[PDB]
Amino acid sequence: AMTYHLDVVSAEQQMFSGLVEKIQVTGSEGELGIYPGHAPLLTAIKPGMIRIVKQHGHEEFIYLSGGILEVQPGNVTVLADTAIRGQDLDEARAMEAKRKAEEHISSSHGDVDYAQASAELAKAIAQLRVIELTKKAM
């Protein structure tokens, strides 16, 4: 037994809702997703990109800027707001955002001032990793 059901929706959209084998979430605090035998996590998901291996067929890559998730005895549900797919709409434009974001982090001072924006920058770079992968999945 190694296949479970996971549902992840943001605001008003379906990112992944059905049978799944293993999902890997990469954001910042905890590079873990969900699998058949995960701990009872009832907190907030980390913002970044997530790779989900479908129970059978192919695998998909989703992106979310944060949300709440809950694990159940056989299934797992998660709710977030900013939702994006590896190839949501614009592909090359994802790089423009990074370049424009670099400028904002080029200078500043303080401990949690610009350093906080750094987490926001990496957040936008997470979706750039899934779009590069979709290129080699066709």
Swiss-Prot record:
GO CC annotations on file: plasma membrane; proton-transporting ATP synthase complex
A Pfam family annotated for this UniProt entry: ATP-synt_DE
Any coiled-coil regions, as ranges: none
Location in or out of the cell: Cell inner membrane
GO process terms (BP): proton motive force-driven ATP synthesis; proton motive force-driven plasma membrane ATP synthesis
Gene3D superfamilies reported for this sequence: ATP synthase delta/epsilon subunit, C-terminal domain, F0F1 ATP synthase delta/epsilon subunit, N-terminal
Family indicated by similarity: Belongs to the ATPase epsilon chain family.
Identification of the protein by name: ATP synthase epsilon chain
Organism: Escherichia coli (strain K12)
Upper taxonomic lineage: Bacteria, Pseudomonadati, Pseudomonadota, Gammaproteobacteria, Enterobacterales
Gene name tied to this protein: atpC
